[PDB]
Amino acid sequence: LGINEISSSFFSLLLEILLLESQASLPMLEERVLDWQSSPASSLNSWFSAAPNWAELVLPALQYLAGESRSFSPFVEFKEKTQQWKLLSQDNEKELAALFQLWLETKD
Amino acid sequence: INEISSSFFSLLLEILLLESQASLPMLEERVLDWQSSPASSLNSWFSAAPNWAELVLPALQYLAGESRAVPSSFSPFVEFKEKTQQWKLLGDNEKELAALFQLWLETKD
Ligand code: NA
């Protein structure tokens, strides 16, 4: 997320961090999101107001993106042996945006 | 990493930050290639105009202070040097730029 802090959805934001890291732990993704949400410009994201604390939603977003919610195709996987999240965003943003809204409607 | 920016104004200033200096046709070619990317239409403000590259000059002239629809405490974000024909930034303004962008949208026509 170099240019700026603006992404099409929370889901695309996560997958954009993962494309750059290639692999990443949960604690690292959490810290990246926390730093990201503290930046004044991030509230310019149209979906930023959909939750009060985005860092805390990193795990449940990843699990949904992994297909652990309940034919969807997984965007990420977690490997227990390495404790790393991996990609399995570009051109999928429209789908991710739709899936994000669905998750927001269905999660709580 | 994606073609998403908070406003057309922030998109223009981000292209200037990298580049550091740029000509009008350079900026116009960059915006043309941007708007032709699929990802670009994801910008919430993309549809506020049908052709963004054709608005690069008036946008820059707005951000340069060459337009009267600006607040009293308006400090210009860019300048154009005629001797060089290059646009440059003037040395965390995104929220202000978003608001200024809407001001421009509302007042330009
Ligand atoms: Na962006």
Residue numbers in the entry:
A (entry chain B): 370 to 439, 444 to 461, 464 to 483
B (entry chain A): 372 to 462, 466 to 483
Please give me the paper's original passages concerning this structure:
Based on PsiPred and Disopred sequence analyses, we made 16 constructs that covered various possible boundaries of these three putative domains, and one construct, residues 370–495, produced diffraction-quality crystals. The structure of this domain was determined to 2.18 Å resolution and reveals a novel helical domain (NFRKB_WHL) bearing remarkable similarity to a winged-helix domain, usually associated with DNA binding. The last 12 residues of the construct (residues 484–495) were disordered and were not modeled. Therefore, despite the structural similarity to winged-helix DNA binding domains, NFRKB_WHL is unlikely to bind DNA. The sequence of this helix lacks any basic residues, thereby making it unlikely to interact with DNA. The calculated isoelectric point of 4.3 of this domain is also not favorable for DNA binding. NFRKB_WHL has a significant structural similarity (Dali Z-score of 6.7) to one of the winged-helix motifs within the C-terminal domain (CTD) of the cullin protein portion of the of the Cul1–Rbx1–Skp1–F boxSkp2 SCF ubiquitin ligase complex. Thus, it is possible that NFRKB_WHL may be involved in protein-protein interactions rather than DNA binding.
Nuclear factor related to kappa-B-binding protein (NFRKB) is a part of this module and modulates the deubiquitinase activity of UCHL5 in the INO80 complex. NFRKB enhances induced pluripotent stem cell generation and knockdown of the NFRKB gene affects the reprogramming process leading to a reduced number of human induced pluripotent stem (iPS) cell colonies.
